[PDB]
Design a protein that fits this description.
By secondary structure, the chain is an alpha+beta fold. Helix content is 46%, strand content 15%. It has 12 helices and 10 strands. The strands form 3 sheets. The chain has a 5-stranded antiparallel β-sheet. The longest helix is centred in the N-terminal third of the chain and has 23 residues, at 73-95. It is classed as isomerase. Keywords: topoisomerase IB, isomerase. It forms a monomeric assembly.
Amino acid sequence: PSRTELLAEEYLRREPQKFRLARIARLAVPPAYQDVYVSPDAENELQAFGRDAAGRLQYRYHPDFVQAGALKKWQRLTRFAGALPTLKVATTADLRASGLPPRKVMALMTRLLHVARFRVTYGLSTLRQRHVVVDGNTVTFRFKGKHGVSQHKATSDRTLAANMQKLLDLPGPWLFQTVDAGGGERRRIHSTELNAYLREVIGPFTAKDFRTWGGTLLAAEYLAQQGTESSERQAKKVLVDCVKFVADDLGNTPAVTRGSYICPVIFDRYLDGKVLDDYEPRTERQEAELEGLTRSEGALKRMLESERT
């Protein structure tokens, strides 16, 4: 199902009465909106959704996402991790579609933003057919990104490779195209269209969250692999190395990477001798809270959660 369809089996339906307190009224959801679902849980990032007068989805978010500087980076990232399982459901629904309809191509792109940390010189939405090489199940991207910075990313996925091969069957130069069955109607997917799709599937989170989350996860994995250091001087040197590694991956400078991409909580922990491993669930309940996340993703979520009071 789609995100809203998945949440429709959970959310309260607006009838002016609600059916399966003052928080809902504060959202000020326009009364003329149709099939309005509102959250029974106060914590949900998506607090309300409904259809406007043109049959378009409209959203009201938790005030924490609209208030100026309401969330620390670690808070935003833990909430983002909570949104990943739902994202996986939504993109799969679109990927099961036949051929190359717009939503399927955008789902493919979204998956690439997630797994490879691309930005939306080139970014994901401006890739050309020359920028991708498919060898069996391996898809390798090589392009010059923002400020001419290197981006080299390889992923192995049968359905990704198969879909990439379908795209490469179309006339170039552009990579991400949607086409009808006959072949006569073909156009590019542009950044505006993709960003709109992201609003649906991950809103209030944005494409940037894939890179802050992904950068933080890559950093945490890097540190876990290197292992802790006894010397403070040495441990801090490892942090500098880690920033360089992640910066190279993300196509950023080290300064911007440490400043904005790697959540510094992971560095605080490392300097105190703690890594991803140390944050694995210790009960069934804890593992259940991490449903839909990978081992590494779940461990990162718990590490970030350790910042809570």
